[PDB]
Amino acid sequence: MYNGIGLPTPRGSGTNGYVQRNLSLVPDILDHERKRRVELRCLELEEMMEEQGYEEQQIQEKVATFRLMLLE
Amino acid sequence: FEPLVRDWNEFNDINKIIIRQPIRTEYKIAFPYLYNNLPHHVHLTWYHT
Amino acid sequence: CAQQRTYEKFFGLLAGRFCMLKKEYMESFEGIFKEQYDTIHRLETNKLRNVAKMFAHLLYTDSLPWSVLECIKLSEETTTSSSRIFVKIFFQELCEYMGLPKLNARLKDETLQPFFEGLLPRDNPRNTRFAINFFTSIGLGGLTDELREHLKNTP
Amino acid sequence: QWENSFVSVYSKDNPNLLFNMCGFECRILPKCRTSYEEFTHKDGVWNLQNEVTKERTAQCFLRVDDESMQRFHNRVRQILMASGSTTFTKIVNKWNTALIGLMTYFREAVVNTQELLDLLVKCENKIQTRIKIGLNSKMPSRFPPVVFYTPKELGGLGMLSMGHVLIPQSDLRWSKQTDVGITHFRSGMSHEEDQLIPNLYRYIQPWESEFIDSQRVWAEYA
Amino acid sequence: TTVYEMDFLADLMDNSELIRNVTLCGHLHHGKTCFVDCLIEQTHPETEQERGVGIKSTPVTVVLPDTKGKSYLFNIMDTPGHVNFSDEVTAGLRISDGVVLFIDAAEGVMLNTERLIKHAVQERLAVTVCINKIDRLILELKLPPTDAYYKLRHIVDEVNGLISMYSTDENLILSPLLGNVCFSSSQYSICFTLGSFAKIYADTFGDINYQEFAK
Amino acid sequence: GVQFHAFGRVLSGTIHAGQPVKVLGENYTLEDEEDSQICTVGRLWISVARYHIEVNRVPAGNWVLIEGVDQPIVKTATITEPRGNEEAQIFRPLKFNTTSVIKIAVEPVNPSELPKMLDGLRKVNKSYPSLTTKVEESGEHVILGTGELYLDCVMHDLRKMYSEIDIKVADPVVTFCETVVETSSLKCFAETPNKKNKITMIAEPLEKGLAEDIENEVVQITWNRKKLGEFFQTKYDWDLLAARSIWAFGPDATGPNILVDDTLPSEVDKALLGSVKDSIVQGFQWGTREGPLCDELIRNVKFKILDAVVAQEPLHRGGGQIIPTARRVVYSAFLMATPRLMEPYYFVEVQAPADCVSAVYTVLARRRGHVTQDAPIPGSPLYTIKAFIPAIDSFGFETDLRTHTQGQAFSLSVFHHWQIVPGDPLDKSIVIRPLEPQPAPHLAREFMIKTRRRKGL
Ligand SMILES: Nc1nc2c(ncn2[C@@H]2O[C@H](COP(=O)(O)OP(=O)(O)OP(=O)(O)O)[C@@H](O)[C@H]2O)c(=O)[nH]1
């Protein structure tokens, strides 16, 4: 493989142009996430309250306690 | 055969290449135009017969 | 290269490339440095200096491993004057080639101090006197007087 | 004149200081500057040493100048041009003297100049070819190496050789870029078998060692 | 460096219920360009070539008679099949309405064939098959006739499994009974469906009902 | 000549010669009619393989080669009636199955002919429907293509027909992507030039399934938030609050990243957040597109807004100077707590005789292969091999394979999926020997140091 080695023509060069290969080559994160913990603490409480009533007052009661009782 | 006819470039800037496999003449003859600057009087050979 | 005109690292380089080519020549070189430390007086000072720069090349080429110093116990009674000149040429070359900072640094770290013990005498005092005097004569003031300060603190 | 001059700056962008002196082409590179990678290798490299700290602080790389290669080549050309009225042994004595006068002057810049090595191959084979032409044939088997290199005592011609070495080759593109190394070995002149013909370069002693040798020899004699 | 027939072509264009827009797709070298060539010589007795690989598609529109003689106008988008040139296929796949996937009898389904059935079902086209290059089972591979049956059945069942894999609705399963698949040999001038073969059986022999036969 | 013949289907109507018609380009939406150039028809042709039979008229339902609609249009065009306007739409431009991933830089030999070369490039961008050419801000012309043979034919046409300039061409490299491996354990929050609006957002990694769904149009947000929510919760137990929080998708309509909005107490500030979402998503998509590391696309990442201190009356100060604020929030989180690089893979299917299987095995080893499957072909004397290969090492793999085995084997290749390149992209303790091949621990490092050197500076 003429891999960029050798002569174009070994013709007037005094050599046979034979090539070879060199054999001897070788802190808000927790506080922002508490408000994230608090986040579903309001929705999912108001959701699980919505499962047992969507009167928007009985769920606001379960959500209000879950917001105050958790933040305590 | 005897050669047909007979400075700086940027693409061969040796800091700006990635060399994973050395290009070798068999590739340079498989795809004459992709792998070669100034390919002239070259016949484009391919076959998967 | 022992038989050569003067030292050219040609033969150094060639033997080092063989070692680079197989481990067989690395253990060959372990045994060869053992052999030349055994047969060191068997030369003249000419041959002595060329083989000294041989092994110095080997060391600072990383071809020979710095463990080899285990073969060098720097007590006056066991040291050939011929071996004395050998190590002086060896370490002159090491210091003036790799430079004194990284030599003294490599002479310092414990990971090879087991071998270096024969070279740096602390347990027995008389060969400490002798060896510190020797490297002082060679002009390695740093290591020498650090070890002598250890000696001063010793009693 | 600015066209026959050459000015070379060394600053925080050029770490190399290149110059061109009596016949050599030198290039100094300190260790402080951008030699994160450093070697100690083939003798084309002098190791300059700071005489007060006695530490090696830079390396000088040597090459033969271009006009010195040209001068050697023109010298061989006139050996050949004015040799049709002389004997084989006179042509080979002129070759011997020219080649000794080059090799003993340069001596390690010749190792590092990959253009010399080709010059010397072609020039030696031109001398051999003129001796063949002197007989009436150039067949490569009527004239094995033994005919030329046999000393003048056994009846040979006595040529001195530097054309049977292998020429190192490596990947032109980066070789014009970044001093890449040596991967292949093109062949020099053709010998009838392995035959391993010796070399003038191995019997001449490098300068950088002669200068240390001399320092010590004259110091101790004084 | 067609007098009294292009008018007929024009009226065919004008009918718009005698034309069919089909894309000729498949894997590499599986018979497309030779199909088209032998076909244009059936109608007209009137980079790439050196490559032996087609790179960019070519369209042909020609007038073909069926097993009843009614001429049709056919829009045939001959594509390249090299997986690198799938671009061209997408082009045809928009501006046409059905796809004739050419499968090799000797190889079966490979990369581009399955990827093209995917591209064809996700663009909601019609899907037909030509199991081409059948002489490679008789002359080349030398197969007992029953194992030829086995191989053909296998190819059809595998392409069926894949076309079911990428499309939920079991609206169509391919089998020659429905008229989904030709059997072919582009170069040996043979292309036939169970329909056409049974009609040949009838026309040369007695009057047997070719439809119920083909079933 | 340079001109073409546009080729297309007439769905409705009937085209005739000289018929003045108005084109609808690819960018044209109904309220940007500059895109529509207005022209006529020179000839009309109908086709057999390479015979052009010229006609005067064609009705709907056929194909036709139209002469004259060349200069206005590129890959796709939608033709409508000229001077008779009712109102028109365009069909969504062609979608391709494979992603064009190979990269080739192009330059002339002497810059004097840079315009001529530019002519050439336009034309081939015309002819080849998947060619993606772009002039990169470092001043180069990169061509983006499918495979080695594809680009060979591209440059064949470039040098043969469209421009007769002599052209230098770089070696092929591939286009990369950026991703993360773990969450931004702490956040840097960007605030307006005029310090009005504070934007706190972190980054974290998605899972592959949903990102691929983003790609497949399975989770198209063209739905309402209800469908979004059932999708997400139903399938991957995403939170319904995560669904209410998900705003948009980034790089474009189809972007494998997601923007999420989770800070409930300020969440009810819909006066201000419902105002700013527009600039918020603009900065999101800009940041995702323009790349944090090497100017390349990111994928497979999820960003979360955790504190939006909005300026009361977020007037034009906010509205204008908040988009760079947003994208710097993105870069901040991303670069902050886990940069990583991603590179494409190629699927290779090798037909081979029974014996030469081992041969191909060895080849794939040299090139970081991972051959997956090898199986008989039923009814054939051949085995089929299926393997993966980094598109980096895919260069010459075909010809290498065929040469080593005397033509018997033969492979095709397709892009399949991206993957983590095994290096650490950001480590200064990694220096690169500038021409020998790197071992794996530093591929990513090298990969960036090279590409930025030509693009990122
Ligand atoms: N044995 C056999 N070979 C066939 C037959 N029909 C077509 N061929 C092959 O057809 C090839 C001609 O080119 P095509 O393969 O048809 O072109 P193609 O299928 O579109 O492949 P691409 O152009 O690259 O997409 C020849 O190599 C034949 O091998 C057939 O009936 N029997």
Ligand SMILES: [Mg+2]
């Ligand atoms: Mg074809």
